[PDB]
Amino acid sequence: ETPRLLFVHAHPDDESLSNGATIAHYTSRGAQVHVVTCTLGEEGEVIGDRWAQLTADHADQLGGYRIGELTAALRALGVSAPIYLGGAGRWRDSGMARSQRRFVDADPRQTVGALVAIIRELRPHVVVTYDPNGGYGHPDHVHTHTVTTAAVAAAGVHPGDPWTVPKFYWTVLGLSALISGARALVPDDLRPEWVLPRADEIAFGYSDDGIDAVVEADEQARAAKVAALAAHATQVVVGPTGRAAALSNNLALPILADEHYVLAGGSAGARDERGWETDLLAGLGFT
Ligand SMILES: [Zn+2]
C-alpha cells in the first residue's frame, strides 16, 4: 500500500520544530502523513505587536489565530489540513499567559479514546511523539507522550478494529547533530539579539548510542521546514539565511535537515554504520 505516518504533537509549531523535514521528506515521496495537534496554543505568547492583544491576558483569542498558522505550516510540509485531538478547541494548553478544559487535567478515557479512534481509522505504519520527558519537560509535551503511549498500546486492544502500530518512535534531539550544526553557523545566519544556547537550555538531548534512526532529508525538504517555521510567525523568527531560528527567548538553533528518533515499539529495519535506521519505514516492505 502507500505508507501511512502519524505525528502526535502538543502545540502548533511543534510539528515543524521537531519533524518538519521528515514530514516534507515523506509527503514529497507520496506517503500519507497526518499530524495530530492536542491543543490550539491558547496560552502562548506572541512575537511582535500586531497580534499582541490576542493573548490570554488581553482578548484570549490566540488559539483561534494559530489555526491558520498551523494550517499554513502543514501546507508548506505537504499535509493538507490540521487535526486537533478531540476537535479544535476541545482541550486547552498550559502556557505562560483558570480553565475547566486543560489538556493536562483531561479525563484519560477521552484523550486516549480520541487518539485510539484516530489510530484505528488511519492505521498508521509509524507513529511519532515525544519521549517520556516531553523534550524539555513542557507539561503538555509530557502529557502528549503519556496519551500517545497509552493510545498505541490500547489501539492494539475502545470501539473499532484493533490496529497494532508497526513502529512507534520518539522524536528526540540529536546532540552530535546539533553541535555540528551549530558549529557550521556563521554570524550572518543570526540576528544580533540571538545567542546560541548550550543544549541543556533547550532540550534533554540524546547521544549517538541512544538514537535508533535518522531521517536525513534533502534541501527541498529542509526548505519546506524553513517555510513551515516562517508560517508560525507569532512563535518563531527564522533568521536571514534560513539556517537558524529562535523562539521569543532569543535562543537560536540551526534549522537542520536531519531529524532523530528512538524506536520505542516495534522491530528495526536495516541500520547504517552508526547503528541507525535511515528510514522510519525500514523493514516494513515498502519499495
Ligand atoms: Zn510545544
Q: What is the CATH number of the domain that holds 164?
A: 3.40.50.10320
Instruction: Tell me how far apart the 2 most distant CA atoms of the chain are, in Å.
Output: 55
Cell of 124: 498508521
Contact status, residue 40 vs residue 101, Cβ threshold 8 Å: no
Q: How many Å lie between the centroid of ligand 1 and the Cα of residue 94?
A: 10
Which of 16, 47, 15 is CA-nearest to residue 234?
47
Q: Which structural domain range is residue 116 located in?
A: 1-287
C-alpha cell of residue 276: 541507525
- The technique is X-ray
CA distance 265 to 166: 8
User: At which residue does the C-alpha cell 526548505 appear?
Assistant: 223
| Cα 228 to ligand 1 centroid, rounded to whole Å | 15
The set of cell numbers assigned to 209 is: 548510542
Distances (CA, A) of 231 to 63, 81, 170, 226: 15, 14, 25, 9
What the block records as the C-alpha cell of 55 is 493573548
**How far does residue 62's CA lie from ligand 1's centre (Å)?**
15
Q: What is the CA radius of gyration of the chain?
A: 18
Burial (0-12, 13-18, 19+ Cβ within 10 Å), 107: exposed
**Å from CA of 11 to ligand 1 middle:** 5
Quote the CA–CA distance of 177 and 7 in Å, as a whole number: 21
Q: In what order do the strands lie in the sheet with 167-172?
A: 83-84, 32-37, 4-9, 126-130, 167-172, 258-265, 213-216
Residue by residue, DSSP assigns 171-239 as EE-BHHHHHHHHHH--GGGS-TT-BPPPGGGT---B-GGG--EEEE--HHHHHHHHHHHHH-TTT-EE-
14 is in an annotated binding site: yes
Q: How far is the CA of 170 from the centre of ligand 1 (A)?
A: 15
The three three-digit cell numbers of residue 47, written as one number: 512575537
Residue 83 φ/ψ, nearest 5 degrees: -130, 120
Judge whether 141 is annotated as a binding position: yes
Q: How many domains does one find in the chain?
A: 1
Interval between CA 49 and ligand 1 midpoint (Å): 22
